[PDB]
Design a protein around this ligand. Sequence first.
Ligand SMILES: CN1CCCN(C(=O)c2cccc(-c3ccc(/C=C4/C(=O)Nc5ccc(Cl)cc54)o3)c2)CC1
Ligand SMILES: [Cl-]
Length: 272
Amino acid sequence: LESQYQVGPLLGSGGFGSVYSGIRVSDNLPVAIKHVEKDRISDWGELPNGTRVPMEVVLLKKVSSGFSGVIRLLDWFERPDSFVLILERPEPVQDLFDFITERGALQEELARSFFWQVLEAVRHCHNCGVLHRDIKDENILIDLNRGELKLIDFGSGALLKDTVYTDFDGTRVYSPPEWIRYHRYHGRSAAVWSLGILLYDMVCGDIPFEHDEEIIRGQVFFRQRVSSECQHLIRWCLALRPSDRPTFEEIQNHPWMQDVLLPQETAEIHLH
Ligand SMILES: CN1CCCN(C(=O)c2cccc(-c3ccc(/C=C4/C(=O)Nc5ccc(Cl)cc54)o3)c2)CC1
Ligand SMILES: [Cl-]
């Protein structure tokens, strides 16, 4: 039974389900307990055992080594109307959207540290065969003591493949023009677009495009002082033609990305 976790308060709820704070009774491990209604589940999937499960579980197991840039699935249960996942919970922790709301635009140095960590994490998912598809500030947690970001919510994700996707259920205003115009995208180039949006969100304090037409026109106006190198990087990720977008390798070799702080230094200077 799930009588082996003590449940605390609701942390948040939405398209990902309802997520509660918890503590594993076994060892007082802090956890997050996520509930997902079977009626509301997008894709389903295939475990070795043979058992049928939400794609989210498959995706999380494919990725849940101990690399700390992606949230670790500790356990899961099936209930009559629902699945419950036990996830690791850092503490103290704060979600990036909150951090930006409280802080406004982030200094470049801290945006760089954070953006590099997000890139390492997304490369991790891709090497484990998983496409997140909903990269944005709300799906990123900051472990405030260690200065470590973790990607969460794989509920809109998919197995990574090299052919075209024609379905999408993440967030529209993070989605690339080719989704909006043709309902087709490739995994990596769409991911790069959404990383451009994310990076703009960090340095300007808000997303650049509210509407379909703005996404499709792809003109980027900066409302804050942002350095030329960072503007270049963002505009490159936000190229209209997918194949003009940089690879992960070209983004991590970009001049704006050099000399990144280690996560612990980041915590010491900007979060402690
Ligand atoms: C505005 N209000 C006040 C600030 C304090 N505060 C936070 O920033 C805060 C701190 C920790 C978590 C969350 C939060 C909300 C929604 C979720 C969703 C999760 C999910 O889908 N998978 C997960 C795995 C691990 C964890 Cl820890 C959370 C999730 O997580 C939010 C509440 C917001
Ligand atoms: Cl959409």
